[PDB]
Amino acid sequence: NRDIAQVVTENNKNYLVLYASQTGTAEDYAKKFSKELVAKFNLNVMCADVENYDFESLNDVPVIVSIFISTYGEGDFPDGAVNFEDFICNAEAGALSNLRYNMFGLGNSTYEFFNGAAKKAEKHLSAAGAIRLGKLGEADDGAGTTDEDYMAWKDSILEVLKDELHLDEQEAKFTSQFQYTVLNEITDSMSLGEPSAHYLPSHNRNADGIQLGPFDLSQPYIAPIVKSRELFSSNDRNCIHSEFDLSGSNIKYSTGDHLAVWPSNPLEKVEQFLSIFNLDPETIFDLKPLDPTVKVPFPTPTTIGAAIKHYLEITGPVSRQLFSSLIQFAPNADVKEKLTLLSKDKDQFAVEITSKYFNIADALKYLSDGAKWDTVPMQFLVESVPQMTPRYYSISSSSLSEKQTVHVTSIVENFPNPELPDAPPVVGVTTNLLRNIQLAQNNVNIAETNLPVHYDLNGPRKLFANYKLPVHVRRSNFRLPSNPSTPVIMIGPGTGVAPFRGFIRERVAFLESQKKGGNNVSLGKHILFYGSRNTDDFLYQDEWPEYAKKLDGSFEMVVAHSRLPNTKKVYVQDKLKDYEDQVFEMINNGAFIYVCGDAKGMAKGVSTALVGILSRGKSITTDEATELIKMLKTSGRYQEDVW
Numbered sequence: 001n002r003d004i005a006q007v008v009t010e011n012n013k014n015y016l017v018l019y020a021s022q023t024g025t026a027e028d029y030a031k032k033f034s035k036e037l038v039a040k041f042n043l044n045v046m047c048a049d050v051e052n053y054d055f056e057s058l059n060d061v062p063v064i065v066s067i068f069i070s071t072y073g074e075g076d077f078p079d080g081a082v083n084f085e086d087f088i089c090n091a092e093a094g095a096l097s098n099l100r101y102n103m104f105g106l107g108n109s110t111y112e113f114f115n116g117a118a119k120k121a122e123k124h125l126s127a128a129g130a131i132r133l134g135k136l137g138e139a140d141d142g143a144g145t146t147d148e149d150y151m152a153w154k155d156s157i158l159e160v161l162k163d164e165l166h167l168d169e170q171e172a173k174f175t176s177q178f179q180y181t182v183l184n185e186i187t188d189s190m191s192l193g194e195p196s197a198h199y200l201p202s203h204n205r206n207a208d209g210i211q212l213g214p215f216d217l218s219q220p221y222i223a224p225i226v227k228s229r230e231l232f233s234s235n236d237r238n239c240i241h242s243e244f245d246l247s248g249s250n251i252k253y254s255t256g257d258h259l260a261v262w263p264s265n266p267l268e269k270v271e272q273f274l275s276i277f278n279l280d281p282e283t284i285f286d287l288k289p290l291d292p293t294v295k296v297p298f299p300t301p302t303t304i305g306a307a308i309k310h311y312l313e314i315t316g317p318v319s320r321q322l323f324s325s326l327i328q329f330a331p332n333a334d335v336k337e338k339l340t341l342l343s344k345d346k347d348q349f350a351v352e353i354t355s356k357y358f359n360i361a362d363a364l365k366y367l368s369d370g371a372k373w374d375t376v377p378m379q380f381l382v383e384s385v386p387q388m389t390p391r392y393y394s395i396s397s398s399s400l401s402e403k404q405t406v407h408v409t410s411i412v413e414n415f416p417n418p419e420l421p422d423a424p425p426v427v428g429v430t431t432n433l434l435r436n437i438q439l440a441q442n443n444v445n446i447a448e449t450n451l452p453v454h455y456d457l458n459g460p461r462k463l464f465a466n467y468k469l470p471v472h473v474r475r476s477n478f479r480l481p482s483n484p485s486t487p488v489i490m491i492g493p494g495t496g497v498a499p500f501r502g503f504i505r506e507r508v509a510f511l512e513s514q515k516k517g518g519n520n521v522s523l524g525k526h527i528l529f530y531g532s533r534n535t536d537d538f539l540y541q542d543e544w545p546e547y548a549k550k551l552d553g554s555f556e557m558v559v560a561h562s563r564l565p566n567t568k569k570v571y572v573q574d575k576l577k578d579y580e581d582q583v584f585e586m587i588n589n590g591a592f593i594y595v596c597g598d599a600k601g602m603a604k605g606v607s608t609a610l611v612g613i614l615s616r617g618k619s620i621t622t623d624e625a626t627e628l629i630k631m632l633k634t635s636g637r638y639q640e641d642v643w
């Protein structure tokens, strides 16, 4: 049932691929690899989520295993794949003696513990007596080489497995794990885009009561945005403040948690995709698993349009592996040839597709000069194109003062193609989707706005009506000290200020209560290092002076602006060296350090910064201080909510 060694044997699998992914990236490649392992060897491969099974019987596995794991927290395994982490990190000496495995670890060198998950996992496996086969792969999203790094590790391991297994090669060739059987009569027992398959007509009374049941990746709660405003005084850039209403359900979130927003690709894009392949969005269809191991991607049956709009991540960078897997369905002989050369030349792919920021469709239109690919099966796509993942946003509202509502401040990703000037702006999906709503919620003449794409605000069967979207809440560790007296140091550049908006709202709804009688019992010094380009992207500028008051002399916000006219750039990490002594004191007083935001280089920087502050302050070596910081990160006094 949920037993590994048992599942593999009963199904006669001769190769087990395991993935421990959080945002589908590892699941994505784990699949590219597993599929290509049947593409050249036709091995019956079981590509499973290291989260659905139980690994007690791991050692009893009779095949060789591929592990695709990503890194989180501080060398942490993706959540809901902790069992695996425990087991592995626990199995004693020679406890996996029979295991033959090879591994690929996705990570981002801009965080400490680069590829820590997989580094650790292979440290234990070793000690557990298992035998690693090829070299240990490290994808580095930091430098944006993930894909090209996978390609490399891939080639290698493919060679190695060829030997170990004495496998004969063959020409590549796609094999569906399902049974694609077109249909005719759209039933209500099927899906038109409903996220989870519980939101099916044949399944809750539209006008019902307080929705229950655990809501999450498997079952998201359709919630309504009850408020939305723009946050930037800018002309180009824009950032949306959204207020979802979760009262209709029993979702109790904490301050510091995250919100997972399930999108639906742009309309201009879903179209560009259906076109190049010459697909009929209406084509109803269904997917039958060819065995208890293959799990159905999404709710089925369904129409092709719904799957391209609600199920398939069509937008985004193109994997060079997807080109190599297309030769089979080339449109014409001249294509099949270029598709090949490209699928083989690291550089040429960059040059002709990657550096130009094409999307699957954009890319293939390019190669064929508009020549349609009526040869690509849908089954192919449903297994060859990544599933759409919800995007996580730091919760900007306080649970204490906004228990029922969830705030989400999300900067819109939407920049000009740096290569093809005449080309459409590189847009993110969930961000603009929120904007289209925000714009439409307020009654703005979108036609006059600079919006880049347009979304089906109605949804499945007007399931998204009243500006709703699928959502759930991820419980995090990002928490404000227990003792309302402990000191607090917050560092959140731009977007990353969100967790501190909560922190303050929260620390205010509190001091408020204590004032309403209970006798306000002190309140530690809270410092917030914010930072943005200028005064047009200054998040919630208007709000801080208000909080500053209710907080007494306990609050203090230091600001830093980078893009400020005639002024030397300045980051929040700079203001730290500026305010070092005060910082150093707050720390010596037990303060808590919170670093949130997008750490392109903000994690290491801010870290290096606090190490500078400490080394200097304690008058010790730079390595010593560094250690000191690591000890805090380990204790929990230095928390990071960076992406």
Ligand SMILES: Cc1cc2nc3c(=O)[nH]c(=O)nc-3n(C[C@H](O)[C@H](O)[C@H](O)COP(=O)(O)OP(=O)(O)OC[C@H]3O[C@@H](n4cnc5c(N)ncnc54)[C@H](O)[C@@H]3O)c2cc1C
Residues within 6 Å of the ligand: 258, 263, 315, 316, 317, 318, 357, 358, 359, 360, 391, 392, 393, 394, 395, 409, 410, 411, 412, 413, 414, 415, 426, 427, 428, 429, 430, 431, 432, 495, 496, 498, 642, 643
């Ligand atoms: C724990 C966590 C917390 C977060 N908290 C916040 C928060 O509080 N606020 C916030 O604003 N964000 C936050 N994020 C980031 C957020 O989840 C998304 O990354 C962001 O909203 C981008 O969403 P999207 O839907 O536009 O992305 P996507 O559509 O996945 O796009 C990502 C980027 O790729 C570009 N792109 C699209 N297609 C291509 C292509 N073919 N080739 C190359 N580039 C392409 C886009 O234009 C965009 O810049 C957080 C992330 C995590 C993991």
Ligand SMILES: Cc1cc2nc3c(=O)[nH]c(=O)nc-3n(C[C@H](O)[C@H](O)[C@H](O)COP(=O)(O)O)c2cc1C
Residues within 6 Å of the ligand: 020, 021, 022, 023, 024, 025, 026, 027, 070, 071, 072, 073, 074, 075, 078, 106, 107, 108, 109, 111, 112, 113, 114, 115, 116, 141, 146, 641, 642, 643
């Ligand atoms: C919140 C967050 C924390 C991360 N922490 C680390 C880290 O400590 N070390 C590392 O090498 N990569 C880290 N990464 C990067 C991921 O390993 C990398 O982007 C990978 O592609 C994620 O794959 P997944 O989406 O399949 O999990 C982090 C990413 C996020 C979003």
